[PDB]
Structure formats: structure tokens, C-alpha cells
From Swiss-Prot:
Changing V153A: Reduces 2-oxo-dATPase and 8-oxo-dGTPase activities and increases thermolability. Keywords: Cytoplasm, Hydrolase, Magnesium, Metal-binding, Mitochondrion, Nucleus, RNA-binding, Transit peptide. Belongs to the Nudix hydrolase family. The lineage of its organism: Eukaryota, Metazoa, Chordata, Craniata, Vertebrata. Residues 3-132 form the Nudix hydrolase domain. Mg(2+) 1 binds at G36, E56, E100. Its cofactor is Mg(2+). PANTHER family: 7,8-DIHYDRO-8-OXOGUANINE TRIPHOSPHATASE (PTHR43758), OXIDIZED PURINE NUCLEOSIDE TRIPHOSPHATE HYDROLASE (PTHR43758:SF2). It comes from Homo sapiens (Human). A motif (Nudix box) lies at residues 37-58. PROSITE patterns: NUDIX (PS51462), NUDIX_BOX (PS00893). Optimum pH is 7.8-8.2 with 8-oxo-dGTP as substrate, and 8.0-8.5 with 2-oxo-dATP as substrate. This is Oxidized purine nucleoside triphosphate hydrolase. It comes from the Eukaryota.
Length: 156
């Protein structure tokens, strides 16, 4: 049994495009990803997701909907990353570059999978189909999956 730390991941998914951020520094730098980060003490997971979306993309939203949960394990790290995944189609304002992220829209036939975390190739398609999911991925380093599980669920 391991301990796990809570993180959020937020996808702004519209009918024909999705907003991703190019991670400019830190964990997973150089990859397009959803917006998010560690949940802080006192806030709900959803509100932590809203906070990180605002900080990293400039977008304020009143609500997010939970679409999945993914646990990440890295060789040599005893702590698991428990990532709660949220979506919304409804945004106010324009995305703004932050120190952490450069936001960019992608058409839904141009999802940049080769420049995203490898796990996204497995669970992102479920997100696009408006399905809910639970996943687990064990990584050697940043590039290599050694074991994983992915399951569609009716309730996250
Ligand atoms: N394997 C992975 N696939 C993915 O799509 N996002 C990941 C990830 N591993 C971590 N993340 C996300 C979760 C958080 O939004 C963020 C890690 O927290 P910060 O580096 O503090 O933003 O990266
Ligand atoms: Mn952050
Ligand atoms: Mn943070
Ligand atoms: Mn972050």
C-alpha cells in the first residue's frame, strides 16, 4: 500500500476543439496537457481544479464536471499521483499565457498525442466520447508505461 497525493486535470472541451497548455517548466515540461496541479488544504477537489484552471490558463469557470480519475505510479517514487479529471464546454474570457502554461486550441482531428503524456492516448478518446473512466498507469521515467489499467465506469 502506498500513499497518494491529490492532483487535478482540466480539459476545456468544446464541440470542435480542445484547449491544451504547453507545460513550460516543471513536471512534464514540453508536453501539451490539461490544466491543473496539487489540491490544497481546505478546498474541494472541484474548486482546486477551478483554481488551477484560472491560474494556468486565465479562464474562470463557475463549475466543472468530473469525467475521470487516473492514478499514476512512477518507478522510484513511493507516492502515487491521484489525478481527478474534469471537463467543461462553457468558458468565460480568453486564455492567457502563464508562467506554467502556454494555452493553445486544437481541432478535435488534430489532438497532439505524440506531444502529450503517453497515457493520454488511452483515456483521452473516452473523454471525447463523453464517457467516464478510471485508469492506472505505472511509468518508468516520463516515456515508458510498464503496466496500466483503464475501465469505463458509470460513476467516477
Ligand atoms: N501521466 C500524466 N498524464 C496526464 O495527462 N497528466 C498528468 C500526468 N502526470 C501528471 N499529470 C498532470 C496532473 C497535474 O495537472 C500536473 C502535475 O502537477 P503540476 O506539475 O504541479 O502542474 O500534471
Ligand atoms: Mn499549477
Ligand atoms: Mn498548484
Ligand atoms: Mn500545474
Amino acid at each position: 500500500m502506498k500513499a497518494s497525493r491529490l492532483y487535478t486535470l482540466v480539459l476545456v472541451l468544446q464541440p470542435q476543439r480542445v484547449l491544451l497548455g504547453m507545460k513550460k517548466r516543471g513536471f512534464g515540461a514540453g508536453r501539451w496537457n490539461g490544466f491543473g496541479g496539487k489540491v490544497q488544504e481546505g478546498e474541494t477537489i472541484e474548486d482546486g481544479a477551478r483554481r488551477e484552471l484560472q491560474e494556468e490558463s486565465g479562464l474562470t469557470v463557475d463549475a466543472l464536471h468530473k469525467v475521470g480519475q487516473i492514478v499514476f505510479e512512477f518507478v522510484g517514487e513511493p507516492e502515487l499521483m491521484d489525478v481527478h479529471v474534469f471537463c467543461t464546454d462553457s468558458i468565460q474570457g480568453t486564455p492567457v499565457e502563464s508562467d506554467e502554461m502556454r494555452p493553445c486550441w486544437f481541432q478535435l482531428d488534430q489532438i497532439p498525442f505524440k506531444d502529450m503524456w503517453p497515457d493520454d492516448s488511452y483515456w483521452f478518446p473516452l473523454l471525447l466520447q463523453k464517457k467516464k473512466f478510471h485508469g492506472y498507469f505505472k511509468f518508468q521515467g516520463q516515456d515508458t508505461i510498464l503496466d496500466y489499467t483503464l475501465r469505463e465506469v458509470d460513476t467516477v
